[PDB]
């Protein structure tokens, strides 16, 4: 359950990054999605997830997301991704 959950989290993160390209009403729905994923992470408790996410999305997006997370950093990677999503949801508008 967990591994496909991280797959869908990364896939919908890339999709929401694609949807918020015009925001550089979707901010409120994005904040609801981030709060939903944060609640799911509260209920439960990235390079190796390449194949599942790229089966879901045949576009490489993936190299942008990994570069943004590695610029951010420079059980724990999940926390880093959720802090990244909340930080983007703060500056959405």
């Amino acid at each position, epitope marked *: 359950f967990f*591994e496909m959950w991280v797959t869908y989290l990364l896939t919908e993160t890339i999709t929401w990054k694609d949807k918020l390209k015009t925001c550089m009403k979707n901010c409120v729905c994005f904040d609801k999605w981030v709060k939903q994923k944060e609640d799911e992470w509260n209920s439960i408790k990235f*390079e*190796s*997830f*390449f*194949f*599942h996410v*790229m*089966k879901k999305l*045949n576009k*490489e997006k*993936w*190299n942008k997301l*990994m570069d943004e997370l590695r610029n951010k950093i420079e059980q724990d990677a999940i926390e880093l991704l959720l802090e990244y999503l909340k930080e983007k949801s703060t500056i959405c508008k």
Partner: antibody
Amino acid sequence: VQLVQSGGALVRPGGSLRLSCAASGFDFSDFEMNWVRQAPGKGLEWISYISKISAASFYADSVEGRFTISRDNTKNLLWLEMTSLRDEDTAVYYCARDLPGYLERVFDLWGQGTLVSVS
Amino acid sequence: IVLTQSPATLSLSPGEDATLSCRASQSVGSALAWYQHRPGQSPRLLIYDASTRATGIPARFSGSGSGTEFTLTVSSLTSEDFAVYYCQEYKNSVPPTWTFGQGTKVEIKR
């Protein structure tokens, strides 16, 4: 469709070597690349993978930190920069092409082979 | 995932059918491939989903298996079918693994 490698070379232990794998007959940007290693009398053993772009690069557990796979999808060359070569890396290095589909992680078409021997 | 080629060396006459095996330590699925390392030549892909057939491969190369037991059945052994056959899992787990078998071998019996 053809994958032509660089040919074997003799290298001292602790040294460096740059393999090459020039592909022809297809689109290099549309295919994931692989490196497969065969020691004498040991069998086949995957060591490296690179994606269509350099977004993903995977290594075997015995080769992490030492080897580096890189590709040039406008010159159709796949490299494997080799660093800190031990005595167990005397082997034949094969350059493999992966099928379309990121789930189907197989090795479709292979190179000519490259006997790397250390002394 | 640990892959075991039980047949190993196989003394068989040419023109006959040869069955093989590739036992996985874990439940993989249909994510298993088969290879043929002919002597003096590069390996080639035969089957890539433990049941299918790769492009450029004759119909005598057939396989089966969807759990932990896998089997490649090659029929009417020609001169180039006496090779070393490998089986590779590509299971969609995290981290991804590319694990071969030891290599079963088909040889001419006398």
